[PDB]
Amino acid sequence: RFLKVKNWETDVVLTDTLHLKSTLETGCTEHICMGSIMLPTKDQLFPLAKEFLDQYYSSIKRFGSKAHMDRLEEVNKEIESTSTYQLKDTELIYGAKHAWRNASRCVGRIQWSKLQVFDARDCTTAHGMFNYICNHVKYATNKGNLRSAITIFPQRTDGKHDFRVWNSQLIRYAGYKQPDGSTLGDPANVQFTEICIQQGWKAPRGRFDVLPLLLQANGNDPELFQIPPELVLEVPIRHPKFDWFKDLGLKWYGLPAVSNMLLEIGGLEFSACPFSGWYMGTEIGVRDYCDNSRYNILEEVAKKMDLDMRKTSSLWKDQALVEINIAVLYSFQSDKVTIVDHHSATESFIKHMENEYRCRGGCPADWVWIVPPMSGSITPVFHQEMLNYRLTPSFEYQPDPWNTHVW
Amino acid sequence: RFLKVKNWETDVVLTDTLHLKSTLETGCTEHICMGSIMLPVRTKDQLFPLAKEFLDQYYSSIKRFGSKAHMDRLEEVNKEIESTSTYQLKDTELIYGAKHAWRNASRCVGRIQWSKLQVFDARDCTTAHGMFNYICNHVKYATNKGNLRSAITIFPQRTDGKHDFRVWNSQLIRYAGYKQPDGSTLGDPANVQFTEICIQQGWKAPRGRFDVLPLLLQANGNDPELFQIPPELVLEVPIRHPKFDWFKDLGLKWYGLPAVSNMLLEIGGLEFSACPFSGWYMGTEIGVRDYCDNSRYNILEEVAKKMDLDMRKTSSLWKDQALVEINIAVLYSFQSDKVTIVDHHSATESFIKHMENEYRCRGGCPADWVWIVPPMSGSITPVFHQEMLNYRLTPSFEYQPDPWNTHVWKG
């Protein structure tokens, strides 16, 4: 029950003990592996608090200390009285960094300890949320020299007073359904582009309209806000070889800022915790541009390359996919916006794995998500066995607000 | 219990009921997923229920469940077991068995073809020379002058585990690999260890970059013997590129017949330790893995160089670019020579259709996403977006230890 993992490219074997700390459940059994599935009170709360504080106080080398026991007592009393508890700033920052550290699907985790945590637990209104969010966006963007950040809004109370960012990311392009049949802009956000409009948003109906923020405070009706255009760093996409590439009329935003997840720390639930780092190239060029249910521009590109698009056997899609991804990187690098290629990021992750096994006893990792969506086996992670398990603190999926919101 | 899988590109949902028939274990638990881990003498005690489960399946398939033919067969197997401590499959059962082991192979993307398998019954074989003969005929039939035909040859089942039949090669056709004293490797690095064994057994190695390895064959638990496959039976394809004319000068070729020979076939508790099987290649097996894995021929750099690519920074995607051209070349050469091959877009698309058809008619299709998704261009193939359930059904193909690690030497 002390498990080993092998890298088949290098024969390096690591031994995992960290998994024995794990608490939550995978969805798998002895009889069935669900590794490729996308999604899996007072008495409940105190053991959850205890586990977290034990982790926290061990990490600062004061396990079994006055301070530790005192803090344990104080939280215990606050729970019994208030039916919840409040985290100290130091605990909050610790919890946030470890939620990222524990994200088994994140390839970018080597950077986990350098996260800028913004405490937004004093926020009361959507206008406040907006202000906190603009500050996040401007700080994280940093004129192209990106910095990882998370902004944490007040924690859940009774599920009727939830703070929520309705957007899936702070910055995303609209998608509008055309009468001619297809789809203009980003098909992923068609339902959301609608709700914004269904709420008052005047859509320029372009291919790349930055969506408004739809912010929800204390459980009230969400409100639209337009992010100041000068806070939205965008990169026009050109190819370092194909001069016709620019005419495609493509651009993307610099800041990937996921806003729909739930942060769990010591039993406490933060339903609104937008976080951001910087892009791996393939996220945009492979998935965003080339997924069928997204921008799906592959055909257009191959056409302009004049490739034999007659038989799949010519691998025109593969050839085009590469060039597109070359362009994304080139463009971002040219405009001095932080981006990482999949080779660099996966090599970084192997090292990070090494570090975590060495200093922590393991590193939970979801191979299905860690291996990039192109050129899989020529990246070192493909040949790396990984053990997937759920540690806490964590980022969790949560239901879409518009299915839950008691209007 | 019913389980649902979702294709996130088409929103198509399928319902699995077949996972209930699952017997073996996955390696996973409620607290840990081992989905990316590469690897996961029987007694009369535990043998009859395994026979029975298989015979129940077999007789259901032919719609004679509960028939007198069914009941008598069960009886016959039972007496034979408790009398002889094992049993013999009928030809019909053996053929069904082999096909279903392939059908159940969760890591195999080519399973649309499962019902079209040529089963060669080699259970009357007694010596390595006889093995060589059966294997020669397999290769000849399977190759069919480039028009490949799926086939499997099944040698006698295990008895006491002391008289095992084994093919010591990992595949029937594979290239030698030679560790040089300077640390560099000549030929296929994957085959270095096996190559050394062959040489030690008396193989006279030509020491080239593409030497077809001899067959090393063990019958009835005796020491293995060397055999050279007749070269006119080994179909090979020179690799060239449809636009790059220097590509031929790399000196590359590959063999046309992928024929895996080191797995164990399990049918109704019986273990067939020698059961070589073959289909035809998906292009990326050769082009991505065989040529471009760092631990294999590893030709990305030389190809990148001849392409004059920006090789100073990985963000130029010179590795990605070279990889695609090599795979174009592999596919081109095979089609040009009329040797059966399938590209990864075609194969994955076929798999989705197969999988849907299997859910509908069988109640499921066990699949290992980690292996099903191609090693290049993952998300632009439809399997990437397909949720899959992995579980182990029998009959099945299983890993087994390398024979040089377990073999008791006679001399």
Ligand code: HEM
């Ligand atoms: C700093 C550079 C970062 C890089 C290069 C990076 C990279 C990635 C990539 C490529 C994915 C797969 C995304 C997809 O396919 O949709 C991912 C997933 C994820 N990332 Fe990171 N990331 C970074 C920073 C962060 C930060 C700061 C956090 C949180 C504070 C984070 C948390 C996560 C989580 C929770 C997932 C999985 C979400 C899910 O389960 O769907 N990442 N990351």
Ligand code: HEM
């Ligand atoms: C006819 C054309 C076939 C194609 C195109 C095909 C395709 C593939 C591919 C690409 C793999 C992954 C191999 C790797 O990456 O190492 C695989 C795995 C596998 N195939 Fe098929 N296959 C075919 C026929 C067959 C046949 C005839 C059998 C047996 C009768 C079979 C049984 C298996 C098994 C057991 C695995 C898993 C190997 C493992 O677990 O290590 N396949 N297949």
Ligand SMILES: CNCc1cc(C#N)cc(OCc2ccc3ccc(N)nc3c2)c1
């Ligand atoms: C449509 N994809 C599924 C998905 C769902 C959810 C949710 N809920 C979050 C997701 O987040 C992906 C993610 C998260 C954090 C990131 C940080 C940096 C970065 N470059 N990409 C990053 C990507 C993805």
Ligand SMILES: CNCc1cc(C#N)cc(OCc2ccc3ccc(N)nc3c2)c1
């Ligand atoms: C070292 N690579 C991992 C591996 C291990 C073993 C074993 N034991 C078998 C393997 O078989 C892969 C396989 C099996 C059957 C195939 C049939 C056709 C085909 N084109 N490829 C096919 C590939 C692979």
Ligand SMILES: C[C@H](O)[C@H](O)[C@H]1CNc2nc(N)[nH]c(=O)c2N1
């Ligand atoms: C560690 C990992 O499971 C291992 O490298 C696997 C990944 N997926 C694979 N998929 C296929 N088809 N063939 C392989 O050899 C592998 N290797």
Ligand SMILES: C[C@H](O)[C@H](O)[C@H]1CNc2nc(N)[nH]c(=O)c2N1
């Ligand atoms: C079906 C499968 O679970 C789904 O397509 C997953 C596969 N792997 C992925 N990997 C990453 N990094 N991101 C994804 O969205 C997905 N999608």
Ligand SMILES: [Zn+2]
């Ligand atoms: Zn699992």
